[PDB]
Design a protein around this motif. Structure first.
Motif, PDB file in Angstrom:
ATOM      1  N   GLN E  25       0.930  -1.147  -0.044  1.00 12.32           N
ATOM      2  CA  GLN E  25       0.079   0.064  -0.076  1.00 12.32           C
ATOM      3  C   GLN E  25       0.964   1.161  -0.103  1.00 12.32           C
ATOM      4  OE1 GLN E  25      -2.481  -0.450   3.434  1.00 12.32           O
ATOM      5  NE2 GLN E  25      -3.699  -1.898   2.527  1.00 12.32           N
ATOM      6  N   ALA E  26       1.761   1.313   0.544  1.00 14.45           N
ATOM      7  CA  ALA E  26       2.932   2.365   0.572  1.00 14.45           C
ATOM      8  C   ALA E  26       3.434   2.509  -0.662  1.00 14.45           C
ATOM      9  CB  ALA E  26       4.172   1.968   1.723  1.00 14.45           C
ATOM     10  N   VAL E  27       3.903   1.405  -1.585  1.00 15.29           N
ATOM     11  CA  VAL E  27       4.049   1.831  -2.823  1.00 15.29           C
ATOM     12  C   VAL E  27       3.239   2.127  -3.661  1.00 15.29           C
ATOM     13  CG1 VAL E  27       5.138   0.404  -4.912  1.00 15.29           C
ATOM     14  CG2 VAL E  27       6.236  -0.125  -2.596  1.00 15.29           C
ATOM     15  N   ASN E  28       2.005   1.694  -3.482  1.00 13.21           N
ATOM     16  CA  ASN E  28       0.632   2.143  -4.056  1.00 13.21           C
ATOM     17  C   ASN E  28       0.331   3.455  -4.016  1.00 13.21           C
ATOM     18  OD1 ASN E  28      -1.672   2.033  -5.915  1.00 13.21           O
ATOM     19  ND2 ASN E  28      -3.014   1.332  -4.047  1.00 13.21           N
ATOM     20  N   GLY E  29       0.731   4.067  -2.765  1.00 16.05           N
ATOM     21  CA  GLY E  29       0.439   5.684  -2.555  1.00 16.05           C
ATOM     22  C   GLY E  29       1.296   6.504  -3.349  1.00 16.05           C
ATOM     23  N   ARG E  30       2.677   5.829  -3.544  1.00 16.58           N
ATOM     24  CA  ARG E  30       3.644   6.713  -4.256  1.00 16.58           C
ATOM     25  C   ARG E  30       3.033   6.550  -5.913  1.00 16.58           C
ATOM     26  NH1 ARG E  30       6.182  10.496  -5.968  1.00 16.58           N
ATOM     27  NH2 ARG E  30       7.722   9.786  -7.682  1.00 16.58           N
ATOM     28  N   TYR E  31       2.420   5.558  -6.297  1.00 18.71           N
ATOM     29  CA  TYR E  31       2.266   5.579  -7.666  1.00 18.71           C
ATOM     30  C   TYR E  31       1.080   6.011  -8.070  1.00 18.71           C
ATOM     31  CZ  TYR E  31       5.638   1.557  -8.512  1.00 18.71           C
ATOM     32  OH  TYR E  31       6.619   0.700  -8.711  1.00 18.71           O
ATOM     33  N   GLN E  32       0.326   6.570  -7.037  1.00 23.08           N
ATOM     34  CA  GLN E  32      -0.888   7.607  -7.483  1.00 23.08           C
ATOM     35  C   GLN E  32      -0.903   8.962  -6.989  1.00 23.08           C
ATOM     36  OE1 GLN E  32      -3.759   8.374  -5.179  1.00 23.08           O
ATOM     37  NE2 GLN E  32      -2.890   8.063  -3.251  1.00 23.08           N
ATOM     38  N   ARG E  33       0.588   9.079  -6.574  1.00 18.20           N
ATOM     39  CA  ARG E  33       0.889  10.606  -6.062  1.00 18.20           C
ATOM     40  C   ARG E  33       1.699  10.917  -7.268  1.00 18.20           C
ATOM     41  NH1 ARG E  33       0.473  14.601  -1.969  1.00 18.20           N
ATOM     42  NH2 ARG E  33       0.786  16.462  -3.248  1.00 18.20           N
ATOM     43  N   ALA E  34       2.576  10.071  -8.061  1.00 16.87           N
ATOM     44  CA  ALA E  34       3.725  10.395  -8.881  1.00 16.87           C
ATOM     45  C   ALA E  34       3.228  11.070 -10.406  1.00 16.87           C
ATOM     46  CB  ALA E  34       4.095   8.791  -9.252  1.00 16.87           C
ATOM     47  N   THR E  35       1.900  11.056 -10.662  1.00 18.33           N
ATOM     48  CA  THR E  35       1.395  11.978 -11.672  1.00 18.33           C
ATOM     49  C   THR E  35       1.475  13.383 -11.584  1.00 18.33           C
ATOM     50  OG1 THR E  35      -0.843  11.666 -11.329  1.00 18.33           O
ATOM     51  CG2 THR E  35      -0.057   9.802 -12.395  1.00 18.33           C
ATOM     52  N   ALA E  36       0.999  13.972 -10.602  1.00 17.38           N
ATOM     53  CA  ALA E  36       1.196  15.050 -10.137  1.00 17.38           C
ATOM     54  C   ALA E  36       2.636  15.666  -9.630  1.00 17.38           C
ATOM     55  CB  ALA E  36       0.368  15.467  -9.122  1.00 17.38           C
TER      56      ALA E  36
END
Ligand code: CYC
Ligand code: CYC
Ligand code: CYC
Ligand code: CYC
Ligand code: PEB
Ligand code: PEB
Ligand code: PEB
Ligand code: CYC
Ligand code: CYC
Ligand code: CYC
Ligand code: CYC
Lengths: 162, 172, 231, 162, 162, 172, 162, 162, 172
Positions: E25-36
């Motif tokens: 989940q911590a890697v997932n939170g990076r992946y959906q903040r990485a666009t902005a």
């Protein structure tokens, strides 16, 4: 504090030792040089107000933005000018404490331990205090081995700020 | 460690000897230089941050590759560790100056330093240029007469610059 | 339950007695809170523990642990907990644990926490599996709870390099920070921003290293500064 | 070595520091004492064989069983008298080394360290060497601060044997 | 580096554990903040030299003594002006490095470790670099969460400078 | 350790460069297939005990001299240490799968491991057989379509196969 | 416990640091996964009367000696049957706590810590509990990511039992 | 290992001491006991093939599901039946090793260390081996103090499995 | 460490075999001479200080340059370290006499001792002379019947003389 007497006891207590001639000679070197350093502390104490107001004016000639720039860190208000001459007196007082004790012990405990977090937080510049201490070195009016003792503790405070 | 009076005692014992009057008379010639030796380490200690940063500033002006991206004194943690090395070597040359010989410098500082720099990738020939610039900053300071009585300390200047030479050939 | 594997000892200085009542200048300065130190002297215990665990080159302002220091000043943690707290600290994991493998990290922490060298190469092999299966927090607990730590340093003495110099000698074993730096010959190559691995001495057309000869007038320069007084 | 010089370097290097005036005063106290401490070493060396053969005879007076009793540990043979006057000269030579160095350096490394283990194994009683050092303490003939330096290392040797 | 990927490995690594659902989940939170977070890192990359030269000029307007005072620490030379704009390029490059990895990894390792030590040695005020970062914070022209990600690391460098 | 994102940063800092637009675009392609990367280490972790114990069982069926007397896997302590070596290596491959590059695999697991097995007397070629038996066991799980939307993960599975292959040539 | 919220606090607390952007993205990855987690916790809670007594019978069909063999470790009595159904209810309730919290925190401190000593002492086999856990993973009757989140904590309990 | 001879050397070596009479009385108790331990180790070796097959058939009667249930961990195939009697012979061999050495030394390194990871991974129930060891304790055929030494290391292996 | 009985088991485990009848009867032979082996080590440790201080006194009369000024046993600390090392060697030889093999003597006393003595400048060939002086001062005392029942234990004395010979050749 680190004095020449507590550094001779601590090196003898570490070895489980009585006070030998290694340690009696070291305390005797303190008592020999204490005549030249107790007159430097007496001559710096008696001419202290001439040295504080002089050394604060030497910062203002050299860095004149500190009297013009607005903000709480600078000596532009009357509050911020009395806090400057307060600080010059703190540095001059610790130098006299080191001359009576021998060794850079009082300013290692009261001044330099935690000083960089103070200058960083309140945005004080350590080059303001070097310029103030270089005035006191050139204007204390001592000579001989009395000036040699005083200048050796001025330069310790500069080396912790530099 | 040994000082200069302890180096003659260790040579004498190794042959089970007393000290002759010629040897004692050469140790009281070392005592009479005692106050001029203490002035030299006082001038090096009191100016110790201007020895280090003026000679580091000089080192990168003429070798500007050391502070370029990819250099060894790039990335300010390695810049701060670079100035730490110069204060360390200046500390032990100051120790060897009051002791009268370089044995505390030899095994506490220089022992294993050349092999340390090869494991880090630090140019050890440029550390020797850093020591050589503190060498004449410290010599020009010890030839400077301010704060001292008249007299002579010129064989002691040649001795202080010899500990800076020993520290600089042990690192290349 | 997988005990540690057996390794052989080796002859070292610290395994055997120095008959030294009245130690000298190479005695290595016990820093203890059993001497009830004041505030100026507990700063010296903290700097000695930073120098022992980190290098002298990692006593930066960004490295110091200000909250582990204040729990030592209030007598909440012992010096064995300060030493454990420096090894599990975030600067030690970043600057030392990440640029070594498991075998060179054991010999750093044996040299700096136990104060002695490794006995042989198999001792590095024996301890490097305590790291890989339990972590750093399990490795430093089983290393501070050996009888080698609790007999020498106890829980209120800063560790030191035990028995480095022999009492007659002037040249002793190498200091453990010069013997084992931060990273070694592996991780040197390109993993630590490095080129070319060596350098010839700097050439110059003004020679700068001329040795004086027997008739040079600076060898007689002695009393040139000033003539002696008298008549 | 327990020189005042190497003790000053060690207190500075314990905390990774330059040599301040705390440590230069310990070195200066060695130089003020080195005048009287070097005329004592010159006069003890010049009267070495007079003091060695005198102190050996004072042990054979107080302990006459050491010349009669058979066995390797006693001075009842020609080899046991050669090894006895060897040991008086060992204690005298270490005293003079401490006078040219300042402080009890050479006596701790070369003489005192391991002395208790030797005197137990070879059955050498330490009361013999105390009597031999008390003779030299009374017969060196010096006075003033020169005897005050000399006796401080005769007394330091007696406290280790006692 | 301190990265949400590598701070997730290094919590399973410290216990010898496989990556459970806690760290995915911590890697997932990076992946959906990485666009902005990655559009800010290339909007600042393209707008670099506008933001570098303007920020160095913003220091020279607020602190005009740095263009007038002689000495090596100040930008009163052609050499010192080149070293000033080199420094603003270091701070701006570390901000774009933190946006492409997530979190304050590269500027913790490449900039702020040892930063206080070299500011004091070379007499560099950290108030200079705060003013240069307040220019970049106001003039990057970003909006939305693209400005939130950008200002999160400009404010990190300001918090550790002061 | 580094992930795929900080690998590009550490290479760019040694040149003193910003990242180019084709380097940001190659990084945002990793973010686009980030959900399929997490589904791969979800399959491997959830069956990690069965990957180790089934491939170890198949290693001793085909190498029956490891568990004969005198063999390297003959005792209770030498056999349980063979099982935990497989669980260490399988753990550090999954650390290299969510990171994107094999920087945690090389620094924390494979550095100096060939020389350790030579000092222990462990047959290093047979450790490579056990790693290759774990490779296809977890590739067969990665290609399972249960509990997932149907898509193409074939470039990701060929990357997981390259992490086990790197571990198998770094150990002989 | 080992929530991703408490493992992000304890990460930043072990570094003496404020919550940077590395930690806020770990928190936001919990919030994205939460609505697939809180529906699996809601679905297994109401369907627990079927999933426990269905999984208890799945053990007795694969291992029928646990109903016939005499002794205290087997479920051949009403005391042993009611304690066998109690054990499956511990495993299911710990999964719904790990879904609500997110991550394998509750069943680590409540269930798997010290469990190998309990099974070894009371002679009860872990292969009985694996067949019960494979039943619930085959018959919880969810799909999408509601099943993929629920199966991630059943598979954690199986990997600790083998 | 854990011979009484090596467990007497290890206490004398820890203090750095010679062998006193405390250690020689310990080794003498090993020698006064080894006339029963070496008659038990020879009597178990000469009756081993009766004891292995009898203990292997006893666990098939107690747990008949092993010879019927498929899977690699059960004795239903000829591969699994040869590995089952191999394991009974490994337990009896370490028992006779512990009798000629004295004390539970050989079976610690060779059988007990790491046993719990083997039974967990390959799913071998430790209650199968307890049923096999209880057959050997019942019918090794020994009596007197010969049977006391054999049952002392049988019950040590039962205590580690239980 | 291993003793004599645990050495036989370590041979037999590596072949996966039960012990034979002749290996059992060879072990019951060591049990029979157990009281004569305990009587030797009691004879040696009871005189352990006299073995060392008399073998040293014969060494410095034979090699008198070791106590002359500059010699390796000249000072009170160098003299006391010499008697320390002889007592350490004699201690681990006494350990190897009750065990039955030299496993504790090789691992815990001799490992790296030759390289320790080369680095010190200690003459390793003179240490071997002092160990052989301790050998026949212990063998002559182990052959003394005052206190023991009369009998022949000459095989045990030829075993004790081999531990002293093992340490003598492993020091030079
Ligand atoms: C301007 C100087 C040059 C330079 C220096 C540089 N050195 C290091 C690292 C180390 N230096 C030492 C040296 C000593 N340690 C000691 O204890 C003593 C005696 C008291 C000495 C002389 C050691 C041990 C190290 C490595 C250990 C550590 O750093 O923790 C570094 C940093 C290396 C790194 O990347 O970590 C630098 C940059 N480099 C140059 O380019 C200059 C020429
Ligand atoms: C009569 C003996 C000869 C002799 C001895 C001598 N040895 C030393 C110094 C050391 N000896 C050791 C030995 C050991 N260390 C161990 O750990 C073990 C057991 C495993 C042994 C046997 C060590 C480590 C040292 C060095 C450290 C120390 O001295 O404490 C000395 C020391 C003095 C010197 O400068 O060499 C002596 C005199 N020397 C002789 O001349 C005899 C032939
Ligand atoms: C030369 C005057 C320059 C100057 C001074 C200035 N200083 C401050 C504030 C503080 N100075 C200190 C320093 C010390 N306190 C100590 O106890 C000791 C050791 C004895 C030292 C060295 C501290 C703690 C403060 C903050 C608290 C306070 O004293 O009020 C200020 C005010 C800053 C503010 O934000 O209030 C000024 C103006 N500044 C200049 O411009 C002069 C050049
Ligand atoms: C009574 C027979 C029961 C049984 C046996 C069985 N065992 C295995 C597999 C292994 N057993 C061991 C045990 C040891 N190895 C050792 O070296 C020692 C100490 C000397 C012991 C106690 C090990 C390591 C294995 C795995 C490797 C192997 O030997 O093949 C198996 C096969 C299981 C598998 O998955 O391969 C069986 C069937 N099982 C029963 O059902 C019988 C009741
Ligand atoms: C040499 C490089 C200098 C120089 C040195 C001289 N110093 C002389 C005397 C002197 N120096 C000190 C200070 C020193 N002694 C200490 O104890 C301490 C520490 C506390 C220090 C720094 C003192 C006290 C004295 C007085 C001694 C006296 O009065 O004799 C000196 C005197 C001449 C001589 O001793 O023969 C000299 C030449 N002078 C120089 O010109 C160069 C630059
Ligand atoms: C590749 C080997 C597989 C495959 C994978 C795909 N998964 C897709 C989306 C997706 N993946 C997961 C699992 C993962 N993501 C997470 O966030 C977490 C937990 C934190 C995990 C374990 C989820 C939950 C989703 C749903 C999100 C979504 O729908 O995008 C995916 C893209 C979807 C699509 O293409 O329609 C692919 C291709 N698919 C395969 O065929 C192989 C077997
Ligand atoms: C051979 C080098 C000797 C010698 C040895 C014999 N000793 C015999 C019997 C014996 N020895 C001891 C001493 C020892 N055993 C202990 O249990 C303990 C401490 C608790 C010590 C110090 C004892 C007690 C015994 C009694 C047992 C007995 O009577 O046998 C012995 C007799 C025959 C044998 O044991 O094989 C011998 C030959 N005798 C010698 O003549 C040389 C000097
Ligand atoms: C004379 C006053 C008495 C006496 C002397 C005696 N001494 C010995 C033997 C030794 N003495 C030493 C002492 C030292 N060695 C050192 O290196 C130092 C420091 C530099 C000292 C103080 C030692 C080591 C020995 C043993 C080795 C040697 O022979 O030198 C003996 C011989 C004893 C023996 O067993 O060999 C004698 C006779 N004894 C007397 O009776 C006098 C009263
Ligand atoms: C510009 C804002 C102001 C200014 C700049 C100035 N800086 C320097 C010198 C240095 N700056 C650094 C800083 C870093 N080096 C790094 O590697 C990193 C991380 C990437 C940082 C933050 C260092 C190490 C130096 C000294 C070495 C060098 O030459 O770069 C100077 C020169 C000072 C000197 O003594 O030479 C100047 C003038 N000063 C100003 O007046 C501007 C307002
Ligand atoms: C099993 C498939 C194979 C095998 C394994 C085996 N390994 C060991 C011993 C060790 N293995 C390691 C491995 C690592 N250490 C690390 O730090 C890391 C990450 C960098 C790894 C992968 C270590 C340190 C050891 C030694 C520690 C120890 O002794 O436990 C053994 C030895 C067991 C013994 O008692 O000697 C064995 C048998 N050997 C095989 O036969 C299989 C092919
Ligand atoms: C049922 C499927 C199988 C079975 C069950 C069985 N279990 C026990 C006894 C215990 N089980 C536990 C386990 C836990 N206790 C906990 O608190 C937790 C975490 C919340 C777990 C996982 C414990 C501690 C016991 C002993 C105490 C108790 O009575 O609960 C028994 C009784 C064994 C006994 O000797 O009392 C039984 C029968 N056994 C089967 O045959 C089924 C296949």
């Amino acid at each position: 504090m680190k004095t020449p007497i507590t550094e001779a006891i601590a090196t003898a207590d570490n070895q489980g030792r009585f006070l030998s001639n290694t340690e009696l000679q070291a305390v005797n070197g303190r008592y020999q040089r204490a005549t030249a350093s107790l007159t430097a502390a007496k001559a710096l104490t008696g001419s202290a107000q001439r040295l504080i107001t002089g050394a604060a004016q030497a910062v203002y000639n050299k860095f004149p933005y500190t009297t013009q720039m607005p903000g709480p860190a600078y000596a532009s208000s009357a509050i911020g000018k009395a806090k400057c001459a307060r600080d010059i007196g703190y540095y001059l007082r610790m130098v006299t404490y080191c001359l009576v004790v021998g060794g850079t012990g009082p300013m290692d405990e009261y001044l330099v331990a935690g000083l960089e977090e103070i200058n960083r937080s309140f945005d004080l510049s350590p080059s303001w205090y070097i310029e103030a201490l270089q005035y006191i070195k050139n204007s204390h009016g001592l000579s001989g081995q009395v000036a040699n003792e005083a200048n050796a503790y001025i330069d310790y405070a500069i080396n912790t700020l530099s | 460690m040994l000082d200069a009076f302890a180096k003659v005692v260790a040579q004498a014992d190794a042959r089970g000897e007393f000290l002759s009057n010629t040897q004692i008379d050469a140790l009281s010639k070392m005592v009479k230089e005692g106050n001029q030796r203490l002035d030299i380490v006082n001038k090096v200690t009191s100016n110790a941050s201007a020895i280090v940063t003026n000679s580091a500033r000089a080192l990168f002006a003429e070798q500007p590759q050391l502070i370029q991206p990819g250099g060894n004194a790039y990335t300010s943690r390695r810049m701060a560790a670079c100035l730490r090395d110069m204060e360390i070597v200046l500390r032990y040359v100051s120790y060897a100056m009051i002791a009268g010989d370089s044995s505390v410098l030899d095994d506490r500082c220089l022992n294993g330093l050349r092999e340390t720099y090869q494991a880090l990738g630090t140019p050890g020939s440029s550390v020797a240029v850093a020591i050589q610039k503190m060498k004449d900053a410290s010599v020009a300071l010890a030839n400077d007469t301010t704060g001292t009585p008249i007299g002579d300390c010129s064989s002691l200047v040649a001795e202080l610059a010899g500990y800076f030479d020993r520290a600089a050939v042990s690192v290349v | 339950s997988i005990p540690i594997l057996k390794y052989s000892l080796s002859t070292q200085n610290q395994r055997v007695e120095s008959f030294e009542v009245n130690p000298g200048d190479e005695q290595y300065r016990i820093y203890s809170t059993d001497s009830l130190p004041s505030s100026s002297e507990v700063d010296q215990i903290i700097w000695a523990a930073y120098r022992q665990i980190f290098s002298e080159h990692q006593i930066l302002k960004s490295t110091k642990q200000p909250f582990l220091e204040s729990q030592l000043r209030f007598n909440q943690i012992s010096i064995k907990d300060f030493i454990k707290g420096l090894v599990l600290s975030a600067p030690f994991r970043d600057l030392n644990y990440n640029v070594n493998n498991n075998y060179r990290f054991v010999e750093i922490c044996v040299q700096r926490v136990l104060g002695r060298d490794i006995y042989n190469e198999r001792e590095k092999i024996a301890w490097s599996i305590i790291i890989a299966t339990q972590g750093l927090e399990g490795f430093i607990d089983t290393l501070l709870n050996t009888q080698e730590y609790l007999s020498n340093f106890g829980d209120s003495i800063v560790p030191f390099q035990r028995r480095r110099i022999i009492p007659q000698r002037s040249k002793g074993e190498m200091p453990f920070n010069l013997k084992t730096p931060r990273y070694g010959i592996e991780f040197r190559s390109k993993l630590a921003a490095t080129q070319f691995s060596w350098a010839s001495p700097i050439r110059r057309f003004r020679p700068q290293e001329q040795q004086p000869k027997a008739g040079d007038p600076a060898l007689f320069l002695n009393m040139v500064q000033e003539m002696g007084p008298g008549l």
